[PDB]
Design an enzyme around this catalytic site. Structure first.
Site, PDB file in Angstrom:
ATOM      1  N   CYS A 153       0.887  -1.154   0.000  1.00 35.06           N
ATOM      2  CA  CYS A 153       0.000   0.000   0.000  1.00 35.06           C
ATOM      3  C   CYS A 153       0.933   1.214   0.000  1.00 35.06           C
ATOM      4  O   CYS A 153       2.143   1.047  -0.120  1.00 35.06           O
ATOM      5  CB  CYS A 153      -0.915   0.007   1.228  1.00 35.06           C
ATOM      6  SG  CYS A 153      -0.039   0.139   2.827  1.00 35.06           S
TER       7      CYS A 153
ATOM      8  N   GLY B 216       0.254   0.541   7.199  1.00 33.15           N
ATOM      9  CA  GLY B 216      -1.095   0.528   7.728  1.00 33.15           C
ATOM     10  C   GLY B 216      -1.888  -0.594   7.106  1.00 33.15           C
ATOM     11  O   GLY B 216      -2.043  -1.690   7.675  1.00 33.15           O
TER      12      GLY B 216
END
Length: 494
Positions: free
Chosen positions: A426, A431
Site C-alpha cells: 500500500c 497501515g
C-alpha cells in the site's frame, strides 16, 4: 526511555495543568486527541506556556502537523528528542522536546488488570502461565492497595502474592524504595528480582496473557471488546518502545528519495537487500512458541519501479497483493508497475508480460510473466491480486470482501511449490499492508489448527512490528482484524 510520555486518559485541561505544575520548559507529553479516532495531541511547554500540536493518523501514517510523517509515535519522539529533529513553529524558531512527563497510570500495561479476583488471579495463572509469569491487580481485602502475583517454577510449581501499598501517592512492596508509579515499581523488580528467605527468586519475566483466546469463543469476545477495543489497542501501542531498531540504510542521502516519506523507513535487520541495494521493504516471517512468509513494502515510485521488480525477482515471489484500488495521486508520485492486458513492458533488465486480467468484484487478478532480459529461462509466473474495494476513509464495513480475496491468495501461493514471500503493498506499506498480513496469518492458523485454537491478536502484531515498524496503524484497523477473523470463524463452522 519507554512511552511514559504517553497519557491514555487525561484531558487538554489536565495536560496543561500537569505541564504548568510538574513540568518545566521543554517538558512534553502525548495523549489521544480522541474526538476523532486516530487523532493525537502532543502538548509542549516552551515559553512558560503549553502549546498543542496535532498528530493525525488516518490509515497510513502519523502526520505531525508542522513536522514530518512517521510510522510510530515512539519513532516520532526519538527523532526529535534525539537525532536530527527540529520542530519549527510558524515563524521558524524551535520547539524543544526535552523532558518526557511520565504517566503514573498503569492501565495500558499488560500486567495491570485492575479489579480482578484473588482466586481469579490464581485461576488464570494456573491455567495460562509459566515460570516468571505475573500480574498486578487491585486488592479487595484492604482494599485500595495492590497485589502482585507471580507463578514460580503436580507441585513443583507455585504462585506467590506480594501486596503493594499505595500510601501518599507512592508505591512500595513493604520495604526499600518507594516509587512514583506502579510501572516504576514493576520495572524495578523486573531488574532487581525479590528473593525469598528460603532462596526462591521472584522473577518477573513476562506479563500473563489476557488477549489469547479460543477461536470458538470469538463472538463472546468481540461483544466484550465492543459492548474495549481501544483499551486493548493502547496496551499494544505501549509495547512500541522495545521495537526502536535502527533504520540506517534508509537514512543514507543516496537512499532518501527511494522512500515515500523520509522518516518511514525499513528496519536494517530485516530489510530486503538488492544487488543500489536499497528498497523500502522488509521480509515478514511469522514466528511463535514450513510456514508462509510475506514482504511488506510501499507502492513503487517513479524511481523504484525497477528495483521493485528486481526484488520480486530475486525473492522468488510469485504473488503480489496490491491493497490500494488505484495508483497514488499527484502527491508523492507512484507509478503503474504492470502492463496493460496482452501487453509486455520492460522495467530495466526485468521484462513482464500481462497474459490475462480477471475482473472480480473486490479485485482484479492479473497473471503476469516475469523474466530477466536475455534469459528466457528465468521466466516465471507472478500473480497480481489487486484489491479495489477498500474505502478511502476507514475500513470496509464488510469483512467478507477481504477474506475471500485472502482465501484466494493463499490458494494461489500454496498452488506453487517452493515460492518465495507474498508481496503485499500500500502507499506506506505499514497501515493497510499490515492489516492484510496479520489477518492472513491469523486465518492460516485457523485453517491449520481448526476452530479450537488459541490465538493472540496483539501478540501477532507485536510479532510483526518487530520486523517492520508500525504494522497496523489505527484502532479502526485493529477492530477490523477482529471482525474479519470472527467472520471467518462463523463460516468455517459450516
Amino acid at each position: 526511555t519507554s512511552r511514559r510520555w504517553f497519557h491514555p486518559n487525561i484531558t487538554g485541561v489536565e495536560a496543561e495543568n500537569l505541564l504548568l505544575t510538574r513540568g518545566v520548559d521543554g517538558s512534553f507529553l502525548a495523549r489521544p486527541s480522541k474526538s476523532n479516532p486516530g487523532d493525537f495531541t502532543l502538548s509542549v511547554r516552551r515559553n512558560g506556556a503549553v502549546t498543542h500540536i496535532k498528530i493525525q493518523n488516518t490509515g497510513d501514517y502519523y502526520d505531525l502537523y508542522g513536522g514530518e510523517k512517521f510510522a510510530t509515535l515512539a519513532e516520532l519522539v526519538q527523532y526529535y528528542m534525539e537525532h536530527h529533529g527540529q520542530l519549527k513553529e510558524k515563524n521558524g524558531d524551535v520547539i524543544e522536546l526535552k523532558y518526557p512527563l511520565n504517566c503514573a497510570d498503569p492501565t495500558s500495561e499488560r500486567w495491570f488488570h485492575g479489579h480482578l479476583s484473588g482466586k481469579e488471579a490464581e485461576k488464570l495463572l494456573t491455567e495460562k502461565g509459566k515460570h516468571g509469569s505475573f500480574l498486578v491487580r487491585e486488592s479487595q481485602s484492604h482494599p485500595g492497595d495492590f497485589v502482585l502475583s507471580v507463578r514460580t517454577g503436580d507441585g513443583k510449581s507455585k504462585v506467590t502474592h506480594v501486596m503493594i501499598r499505595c500510601q501518599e501517592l507512592k508505591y512500595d512492596v513493604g520495604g526499600g524504595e518507594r516509587f512514583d508509579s506502579l510501572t516504576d515499581l514493576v520495572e524495578h523488580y523486573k531488574k532487581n528480582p525479590m528473593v525469598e528467605t528460603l532462596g526462591t527468586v521472584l522473577q518477573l519475566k513476562q506479563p500473563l496473557n489476557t488477549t489469547r483466546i479460543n477461536a470458538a469463543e470469538i463472538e463472546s469476545r468481540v461483544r466484550e471488546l465492543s459492548k474495549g477495543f481501544w483499551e486493548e489497542f493502547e496496551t499494544l501501542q505501549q509495547q512500541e518502545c522495545k521495537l526502536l531498531y535502527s533504520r540506517k540504510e534508509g537514512q543514507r542521502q543516496e537512499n532518501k528519495n527511494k522512500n515515500r516519506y523520509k522518516n518511514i523507513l525499513p528496519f536494517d535487520h530485516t530489510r530486503v537487500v538488492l544487488h543500489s541495494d536499497y528498497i523500502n521493504a522488509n521480509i515478514i516471517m511469522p514466528e511463535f512458541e514450513p510456514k508462509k512468509s510475506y514482504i511488506a513494502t510501499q507502492g513503487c515510485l517513479q524511481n523504484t519501479v525497477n528495483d521493485f521488480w528486481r526484488m520480486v525477482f530475486q525473492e522468488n515471489s510469485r504473488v503480489i497483493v496490491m491493497t490500494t484500488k488505484e495508483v497514488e495521486r499527484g502527491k508523492s508520485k507512484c507509478v503503474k508497475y504492470w502492463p496493460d492486458e496482452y501487453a509486455l513492458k520492460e522495467y530495466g533488465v526485468m521484462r513482464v508480460r500481462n497474459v490475462k486480467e480477471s475482473a472480480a468484484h473486490d479485485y482484479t487478478l492479473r497473471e503476469l510473466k516475469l523474466s530477466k532480459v536475455g534469459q528466457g529461462n528465468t521466466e516465471r509466473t507472478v500473480w497480481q491480486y489487486h484489491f479495489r474495494t477498500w474505502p478511502d476513509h476507514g475500513v470496509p464495513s464488510d469483512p467478507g470482501g477481504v477474506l475471500d480475496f485472502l482465501e484466494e491468495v493463499h490458494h494461489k501461493q500454496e498452488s506453487i511449490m517452493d515460492a518465495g514471500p507474498v508481496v503485499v503493498h500500500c502507499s506506506t506499506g505499514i497501515g493497510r499492508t499490515g492489516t492484510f498480513i496479520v489477518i492472513d496469518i491469523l486465518i492460516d492458523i485457523i485453517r491449520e489448527k481448526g476452530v479450537d485454537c488459541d490465538i493472540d491478536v496483539p501478540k501477532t502484531i507485536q510479532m510483526v512490528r518487530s520486523q517492520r515498524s508500525g504494522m497496523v496503524q489505527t484502532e479502526a484497523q485493529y477492530r477490523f482484524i477482529y471482525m474479519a477473523v470472527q467472520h471467518y470463524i462463523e463460516t468455517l463452522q459450516r
